[PDB]
Design a protein around this ligand. Structure first.
Ligand SMILES: *[C@@H]1O[C@H](CO)[C@@H](O[C@@H]2O[C@H](CO)[C@@H](O)[C@H](O)[C@H]2NC(C)=O)[C@H](O)[C@H]1NC(C)=O
Ligand SMILES: *[C@@H]1O[C@H](CO)[C@@H](O)[C@H](O)[C@H]1NC(C)=O
Ligand SMILES: *[C@@H]1O[C@H](CO)[C@@H](O)[C@H](O)[C@H]1NC(C)=O
Ligand SMILES: *[C@@H]1O[C@H](CO)[C@@H](O)[C@H](O)[C@H]1NC(C)=O
Ligand SMILES: *[C@@H]1O[C@H](CO)[C@@H](O)[C@H](O)[C@H]1NC(C)=O
Ligand SMILES: *[C@@H]1O[C@H](CO)[C@@H](O)[C@H](O)[C@H]1NC(C)=O
Ligand SMILES: *[C@@H]1O[C@H](CO)[C@@H](O)[C@H](O)[C@H]1NC(C)=O
Ligand SMILES: *[C@@H]1O[C@H](CO)[C@@H](O)[C@H](O)[C@H]1NC(C)=O
Ligand SMILES: *[C@@H]1O[C@H](CO)[C@@H](O)[C@H](O)[C@H]1NC(C)=O
Ligand SMILES: *[C@@H]1O[C@H](CO)[C@@H](O)[C@H](O)[C@H]1NC(C)=O
Ligand SMILES: *[C@@H]1O[C@H](CO)[C@@H](O)[C@H](O)[C@H]1NC(C)=O
Lengths: 403, 115, 186
């Protein structure tokens, strides 16, 4: 049975969206050569198909962020009074002193992270200020209104009672929090400081940017390829050749570059599917971990879960899990049940523990012996069917009333 | 003269014998926002990647033509980019604004109060 | 797109095989035939790859739907904001062309009131802790009620339990708890 416990903070990062791109099919394949466009028009609707596919990727990009970061219609602002029940929240909350609306962890993350060929790039619909505002609103909501604001109107609750409920949901009585709240506050502050120092890495974010950069660079480098023709420059081929028989080189170049576009578009579609799946998973995590307490094991962090904390990141989101874990161990002797007067007893919710001196009952996650009463247990059946049992009396609080 | 892409971008004139720069001139894409055929007919063209050089309203998403700019906050209806959304509100014409986010309201939060 | 893409010369003389197989000498038709075959095969490859992508997407959505059907309908789920908005009561499915329709029935608190609360209560120098609810007071006395429905009750020993003195729990208040067993003693 545990005797002590430490509160920890763990991190996990999930990608949300990539950098939308857009490549014009016709202007890439042929430059100012009008006749190069004319010969392309024989092939038909390939350019239209490619353009439509890339536009679909572009719109899905904004769809992801709209899905994962828009869960509150009321922008909740933290009250000016800080120090919520002895917990120091100064690194996460955005300080008005900073010009940029980020806070310390956002700034650290954001600093840590590193057209004649139709490589047009479009901006996202939401600016970093907007996502920072979403993060601040969600943080304030879950830090002041508990969990009962993703289900309806926000209700103000002191932080201490909020955490007290959160303990009640994991299998421990309210006594532990109010008995040692200064200790839990010190441990939480130390953990936040430790995680702040740790990032001072982001392996799951630099990967996708590098992937897109590599793909685009391969496209651009493919231009210099001759593709089994006289040369590579369209203007150069135009000058030294004749329209009656220019069809050979132009046709070969068209085929080669079109095939390259086909490969690139297929790769982009695959990557988009993967990214959108990741974003959907992140949205589920936001709905479960943040606006509530989930009993699913090792999903909202590691170990017993208490409460989460979201953040912001370039093309991504950073989560902060607050868990609860047993610390020390102490062996004890157990018994399946206890017999008092030929009647079998069973514990209500805890377990029977025998120090050796006497017998006691305590819950399953925090040692706290109690005198064996008739209210912490109940009776059923005889004592002749249970495998293991020991002889011991059961106290009755009715005796003092007999005076 | 070449670049990272090994493309010609700097030339020497055999007469003047000087360093000459080459910059791209072909660029542009058209996006058309409409309030709907049923509603009205006024439109507001948008250029994706050009400086307002060629009622204009410069945004980081490009150069916008044919829309009035206001500071009045409104819920976002149609997207353009960089937190700019258009609409057909006043007579009625095409307008642009910074995106709005719902409404603002804090909570009581007394250290001994409940709801 | 496929049927439109069928009719396009792809750099050949024409789009009709019969016309090609009539105007040109058969030893000369192979170039045009090969060009047409390559073009049509490329177009078919594009179509099939795109269809495969969309089928994969639909399969993912379908597994999502199966999970939702298994969880929301066949009993409750504590997973907040997963079987609807707010707290979840039940769910009823419906069949729609190439899809399903779900009707989530939910619970939403309507309107509230200001109240004055306190963590724990001190009665005999030893603390008391509520077993399921909260301590609230409108001004007159203290009351215990469920977490999300105002059901005031008289504080009893059967509503709380003791865990030690009131000298360490911050925010405690001084009041009394009534014992129903004492009047029965006479
Ligand atoms: C559970 O572990 C914590 C962490 O060590 C203990 O807290 C320390 O207690 C000692 C004893 O007074 C203090 O000197 C330290 O300053 C405390 N903090 C730390 C970080 O060491 C706590 O005492 C343990 N629980 C019990 C019941 O002893
Ligand atoms: C929180 O810790 C920082 C670290 O130095 C300190 O500057 C700040 O005053 C602390 N806030 C509170 C409320 O203790
Ligand atoms: C478990 O703790 C008890 C304390 O009573 C001790 O006697 C025993 O040796 C411990 N078990 C092991 C494997 O050391
Ligand atoms: C427990 O295991 C010991 C080891 O052999 C055995 O002697 C004893 O009978 C067992 N008792 C129960 C209740 O399983
Ligand atoms: C408990 O006491 C009864 C009464 O004598 C006895 O029969 C039984 O064997 C005891 N159980 C033990 C010794 O485990
Ligand atoms: C050649 O260049 C020189 C110097 O730039 C100039 O003076 C001369 O007129 C040029 N002659 C011709 C034929 O281009
Ligand atoms: C236009 O919209 C109005 C109301 O939205 C409707 O009554 C009317 O029938 C619509 N007309 C057309 C041509 O769609
Ligand atoms: C547009 O050109 C003007 C003139 O040089 C310049 O001052 C301005 O910064 C340019 N705007 C952008 C967005 O490049
Ligand atoms: C609310 O206060 C009034 C007067 O202060 C009192 O009569 C009433 O009993 C209180 N409410 C309850 C539920 O007791
Ligand atoms: C609540 O804050 C006020 C402000 O000074 C303070 O006097 C009071 O002691 C606080 N109550 C608790 C329970 O911390
Ligand atoms: C509660 O009553 C005790 C006993 O009279 C007293 O010592 C203590 O100061 C009181 N506390 C409050 C908050 O009334």
């Amino acid at each position: 049975i545990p005797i002590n416990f430490t509160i920890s903070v763990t991190t996990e990062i999930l990608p949300v969206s990539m950098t939308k791109t857009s490549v014009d099919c016709t202007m890439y394949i042929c430059g100012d050569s009008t006749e190069c466009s004319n010969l392309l028009l024989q092939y038909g609707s390939f350019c239209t198909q490619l353009n439509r596919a890339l536009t679909g990727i572009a719109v899905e990009q904004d769809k992801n962020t709209q899905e994962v970061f828009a869960q509150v219609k009321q922008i909740y602002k933290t009250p000016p009074i800080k120090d919520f029940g002895g917990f120091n929240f100064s690194q996460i909350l955005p300080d008005p002193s900073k010009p940029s609306k980020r806070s310390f962890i956002e700034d650290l993350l954001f600093n840590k992270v590193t057209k004649f060929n139709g490589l047009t790039v479009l901006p996202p619909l939401l600016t970093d200020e907007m996502i920072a505002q979403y993060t601040s609103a969600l943080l304030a909501g879950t830090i002041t209104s508990g969990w009962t604001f993703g289900a309806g109107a926000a209700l103000q609750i002191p932080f201490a009672m909020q955490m007290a409920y959160r303990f009640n949901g994991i299998g421990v009585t309210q006594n532990v929090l109010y008995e040692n709240q200064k200790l839990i506050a010190n441990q939480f502050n130390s953990a936040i400081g430790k995680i702040q120092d740790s990032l001072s890495a982001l392996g799951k974010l630099q990967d996708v940017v590098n992937q897109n950069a590599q793909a685009l660079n391969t496209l651009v480098k493919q231009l210099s390829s001759n593709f089994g023709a006289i040369s590579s420059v369209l203007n150069d081929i135009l000058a030294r050749l004749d329209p009656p028989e220019a069809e050979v080189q132009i046709d070969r170049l068209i085929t080669g570059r079109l095939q390259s576009l086909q490969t690139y578009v297929t790769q982009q579609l695959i990557r988009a599917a993967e990214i959108r799946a990741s974003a959907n998973l992140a949205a589920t995590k936001m709905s479960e971990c943040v606006l509530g307490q989930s009993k699913r094991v090792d999903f909202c962090g590691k170990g017993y879960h208490l409460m989460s904390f979201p953040q912001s990141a370039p093309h991504g989101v950073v989560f902060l899990h607050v868990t609860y874990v047993p610390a020390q161990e102490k062996n004890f002797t157990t018994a399946p049940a206890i017999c008092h007067d030929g009647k079998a007893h069973f514990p209500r919710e805890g377990v029977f523990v025998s120090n050796g001196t006497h017998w006691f009952v305590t819950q399953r996650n925090f040692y706290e012996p109690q005198i064996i009463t008739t209210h912490n247990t109940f009776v059923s059946g005889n004592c002749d069917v249970v495998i293991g049992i020991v002889n011991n009396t059961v106290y009755d609080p009715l005796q003092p009333e007999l005076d | 003269g070449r670049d990272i892409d090994d493309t010609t971008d700097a030339v020497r004139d055999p007469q003047t014998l000087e360093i000459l720069d080459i910059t791209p001139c072909s660029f542009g894409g058209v996006s058309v926002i409409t309030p709907g055929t049923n509603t009205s007919n006024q439109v507001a063209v948008l250029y994706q990647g050009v400086n307002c050089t060629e009622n204009v309203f410069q945004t980081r998403a490009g150069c916008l033509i044919g829309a009035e700019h206001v500071n009045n906050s409104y819920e976002c209806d149609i997207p353009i980019g960089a937190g700019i959304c258009a609409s057909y509100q006043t007579s009625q014409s095409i307008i642009a604004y910074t995106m709005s986010l719902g409404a603002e309201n804090s909570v009581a939060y007394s250290n001994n109060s409940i709801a």
